[PDB]
Design a protein around this ligand. Structure first.
Ligand SMILES: Cc1cc(C(N)=O)ccc1-n1nc(C(C)C)c2c(-n3cnc(-c4cnn(C)c4)c3)ccnc21
Length: 212
């Protein structure tokens, strides 16, 4: 016999409101999602590198500091993989929950004053820009001080965390975009390449696009 370990969490109300705004909108410049996820990845890589400066054993889980983009037409997935710090279970639930809460509030006050939705990175919640293009987002992540986890939401008011039974990563994060049917251009090579070139030109880590 096998074991799963699964918990369902309700988003705080304003967060729910923002996620719905993002998933429903018809905003015409959605490619900013890729910039935002890549920037999250780069920050994650900045943090592990910094930690390694003091303690080199932090990289025993892997020394390569990189970002990969993996489109999958059959599964209609676009995957962004990094070997950054990753997130513990407590990060996914409580700690990022606290950040998402204040960030959302500030973001929402800012939108009300006429800020654009592309401004989202400033409020520490850029990850939610995923739902511009994604019906579901699955985040697989592994931090040095904790086990491998899967956080998942469909922007319907709740989210799940679980112990990922799946293939082990060493350290880092995998953000799986289950794309909307109207958003499959983000599986095209030419399209990903030009978004990266345009928005993520000076990212200090190697970005590799896997061509199918
Ligand atoms: C911080 C982060 C880093 C990376 C990376 N290292 O690639 C990828 C994704 C994310 N994010 N960011 C967030 C929120 C701050 C928006 C996030 C996240 N999360 C989103 N909402 C929550 C939340 C809201 N209420 N509660 C209780 C938890 C956690 C789950 C997984 N990865 C996440």
């Amino acid at each position: 016999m096998e074991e799963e370990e699964v918990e369902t969490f309700a988003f705080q109300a304003e967060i729910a409101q923002l996620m719905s705004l993002i998933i429903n909108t018809f905003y015409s410049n959605k490619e900013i999602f890729l910039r935002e996820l890549i920037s999250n990845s780069s920050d994650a890589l900045d943090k592990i590198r910094y930690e390694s400066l003091t303690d080199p054993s932090k990289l025993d889980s892997g020394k390569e500091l990189h970002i990969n983009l993996i489109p999958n037409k059959q599964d209609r997935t676009l995957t962004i993989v990094d070997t950054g710090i990753g997130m513990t279970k407590a990060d996914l639930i409580n700690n990022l929950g606290t950040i998402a809460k204040s960030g959302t509030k500030a973001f929402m006050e800012a939108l009300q004053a006429g800020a654009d939705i592309s401004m989202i990175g400033q409020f520490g919640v850029g990850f939610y820009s995923a739902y511009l293009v994604a019906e579901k987002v699955t985040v697989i992540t592994k931090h040095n001080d904790d086990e491998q986890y899967a956080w998942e939401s469909s922007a319907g008011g709740s989210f799940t965390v679980r112990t990922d039974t799946g293939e082990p990563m060493g350290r880092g994060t995998k953000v799986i975009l289950h794309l909307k049917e109207d958003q499959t251009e983000y599986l095209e090579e030419r399209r990903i390449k030009e978004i990266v070139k345009k928005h993520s030109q000076f990212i200090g880590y190697p970005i590799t696009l896997f061509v199918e």
